[PDB]
Symmetry: D2
Subunit: 316 residues, 4 copies
């Protein structure tokens, strides 16, 4: 009989850990580092948080398994501090290697993601090189996956992504971002969950209404993977370039923060970098104004106090 048919559900993959990358075995990757090191590369800064974990998970192996190939170097991991900036280089295969598939530290230093930007510039660090392909299938081990990007690219991973819309709401999904929008009378952004900030450009292939979108009228800037959509719009708002992105995990919501309220005026100044966490004396500013805002204003919530959108400045 018939029958159309119809299926598919999405998504069930928020805040998971994750992630490893062996396989792909460090054989090809380590040989790439050796051939990259002689090319003058110095550091690696990850494009995703789990990528930084995968380096940290496998780094002691490359500390010695690379030395098993009579080549000497040292690699040390670091920590995560938002924003997770972008490197200006990448490494490519080069699939030829001379080593054994499963068969330190006096030499020069090859950096790994760490708060040491003053040591080596981002212009001398590879970025967004290794990524799925292949897949995440199928026993939660990925996968064998994490193939090398043949072509230099700025877009994020195209595999672990999602976007959907059903009659009241549209969401954009990846490992970290959970931008969500709703429809009261006009489609507009409602809430979003941020757990990191990646500088990779959001890919058009997983957006909605990607027509006539103004880069200056967004909510989340494109440079921090802001989806090109009308769902990134909101009346009386503009891009949050100077927002508190340096914080690690964030939250998007239209509301009033605790003990504070905002009055719509016109004497209030123009946009400016966010504030309110915290006052030097530990106090707060109960007064708040915004010129072209729209109540409820944008509050910033995370592993900290409160911040407000750049349209919101204190009266005094």
């Amino acid at each position: 009989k018939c029958g159309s048919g119809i299926f598919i559900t999405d998504n069930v993959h928020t805040w998971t850990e994750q992630y490893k990358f062996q396989p792909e075995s460090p054989s090809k990757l380590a040989s790439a580092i050796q051939k990259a090191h002689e090319e003058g590369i110095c550091g690696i800064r990850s494009v995703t948080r789990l990528e930084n974990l995968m380096w940290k998970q496998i780094t002691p192996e490359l500390n010695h398994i690379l030395t098993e190939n009579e080549v000497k170097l040292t690699i040390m991991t670091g920590d995560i501090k938002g924003i997770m900036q972008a490197g200006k280089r990448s490494l490519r295969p080069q699939p030829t290697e001379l080593k054994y598939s499963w068969k330190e530290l006096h030499n020069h230093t090859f950096l790994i993601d760490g708060p040491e930007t003053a040591e080596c510039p981002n212009t001398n660090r590879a970025w967004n090189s290794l990524e799925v392909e292949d897949y995440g299938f199928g026993v939660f081990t990925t996968n064998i996956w994490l193939k090398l990007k043949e072509r230099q690219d700025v877009f994020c991973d195209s595999k672990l992504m999602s976007a959907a819309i059903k009659d009241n709401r549209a969401v954009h999904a990846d490992m970290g971002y959970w931008i969500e929008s709703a429809l009261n009378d006009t489609w507009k952004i409602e809430k979003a969950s941020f757990i990191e900030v990646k500088s990779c450009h959001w890919p058009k292939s997983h957006t909605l209404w990607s027509n006539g979108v103004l880069e200056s009228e967004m909510i989340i800037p494109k440079n921090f993977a802001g989806p090109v959509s009308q769902h990134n719009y909101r009346p009386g708002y503009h891009t949050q370039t100077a927002g508190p992105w340096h914080l690690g995990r964030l939250e998007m919501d239209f509301d009033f923060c605790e003990g504070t309220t905002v009055v719509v005026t016109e004497d209030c100044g123009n946009r400016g970098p966010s504030l309110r966490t915290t006052t030097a004396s530990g106090k707060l500013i109960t007064e708040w104004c915004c010129r072209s805002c729209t109540l409820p204003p944008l509050r910033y919530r995370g592993e900290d106090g409160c911040w407000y959108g750049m349209e919101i400045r204190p009266l005094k």
Copy 2:
């Protein structure tokens, strides 16, 4: 604790019946027809199949409940024959009415959807007037719903619609259309299920990659609600303007029809209207050629035999 969170599944609403529209009670609707009839309107042709059913489900009521308001007219329903064309008019509130909320046929004739295009032109028939709003909630009775469109519009319903994508496939969903696309190496259309053909324009708010889309490089023409997307692309193809849309229920697939095969050549002519159901003698044409096609070609499947895309013509 936290918590993101994450939910939502879609979709579960293919080939359902459906559909009624009372409530909204025929009180306001019937009074609108009475005020529309004195405005020179003659016919109604539905924008969706279920709308035609709703007329057929409620038509005997307006045959007499309208006469209870000392106004006389006659309305007769018809049948469905693809394509379900579009009327060039609409009716609008006008919310003032003088009748009773629940408290023929000698006069002039007000037409209803039926195969009688030679009687009254489509330019004298209302179209795409009544639609949800409000909703479908919540006991499968809609809803109270089916409010009047204040503004004349060409886009289809924005409520009962859906679209999604998850790491391998993207689909566009409504009551009837089930356009689906996949990713082997480049994103392209794979299959689609057609059960009617509505002339309402597909709205951009539920599409994907709606940038740089060429109206001449689609698969499904925009005039028959072809989503503006790269997922409507396919290499070596163009728009199916002259396809066998007159058939009621269709099927999109890249394959070879039974007992036939296609050889890629260059002497084969250019595109032309589809064929192969059936030969005047009941035979078939085993030979097939296409100039700029790409195997497997486009076959048309439905409540009939086989048809091929316009790029596919017989050698002889």
Copy 3:
């Protein structure tokens, strides 16, 4: 990484049509009838509604394709009228056949489902013989499926079934039955959807709390596939043996029917067969009493008016 994992959703398969059974091709089935006819079998009465449709869908073929095997007989289908009773016989393979896989009506009559119980007794009709196995996979055509039951059995089909529970509610699912229960303070039945009534016994392998269940304390009797569960319990209630099961499609709900109310008393009589659709004069009985009931009482809703549970009788 890890990873548990976790998936599965259920269900999306209510009120679907469905259903065909070719394949399995009528080759083996028809030969079985021919060998069954010489065994003295006379009638066929389906165990599911869709089975009756499958007979009706394929019956003209066996009217003549059986005659192609130089054996003559006649078969006529009928209609569906609740309840869909059970036959006391069945047909079994016997896989040997002498005919062609795809290569009337003067002789005796082999009855099929029809309101002709006075003609041939149910004790001379086969029942619950053909069923899935194999499956419903995978293009909505089943399947090839509908294999013969090697062993005589009374339980319903074990393939197309479902049951689940998640923190507030438990449901039992098949093609037609949608028994549902909830938890306010003690687990109890809340609502159920009936679209047919099959006499096959509900299988224990898809129930819940199948311990210490009293056959006299159910809501839906076992003989009409009442799941053996505590979720079939309700305080102050018993089995609905004499309910209005003769109606085709039903509805289970705890509420008051329109224009009527029930007062809890003790002078009211004991249980008795249901009523209230309709009064001989077309009226209703606004007064209602029940001895050991519990408000809200059980109302019967369907393609008819209202009926009440046997615990509910009029005061006069």
Copy 4:
């Protein structure tokens, strides 16, 4: 229109963290401990892992906020080491309290879950006292929840549970347990995921086929929350009472561990406590026998090497 309807999906809640219990505010709970302490109670050992985390998450508050009520004591948290045994007492409200809703350590010791069984016996520790009710709704903060159990009970929490079955497989779900069974020809257990081991009895309200189940023919013993079901059966097997439950996180699978194979014989001895992780010399035993087993045998997998079921013993 109609409409049945049909919905519900399950589950999406594996390996989450979780969990906090404020609210309910420690006001009532702390006063309960103070009144419990004068009743001779000594320690607390949690029934779930997240409960132990909840104690660890809130313990410093009760270290001092209890002292704010001019009563002095000390509470020290510990660690988790399987199995998470059961205490023989509980604490009950007693809702009367004299303190302030949000307005150490010289005194006696009130113990908390930790590897100190030699200090205070489990017979002098409360267990399975606090649990949801109320709910987990609705911002991932629960909830306000964690109400006191009015009645002493041995069953686990009834709220955060799940069980389902759909045409090929049945699963039992809670925070940690993911017992799963399938159907090849007879229903039998296939795989299960264990991340803790709780001594609370599995509740019958969320099982399947809870009839005629023999406590000696299960796979997972009832004392460690083994669902009473036929899905806990397996031919040629019995209960895993003496299994390696002392390990924290486990895995159920029918397979052969790496580098080892099992031969079915009869000279092999009877059942015995599991082994094979590891040999005193770090070796393995490639030879394996089992009297009444059935290939593939039961392997134990987790944060360790391999173990085999009690039916499997070495030949030598």
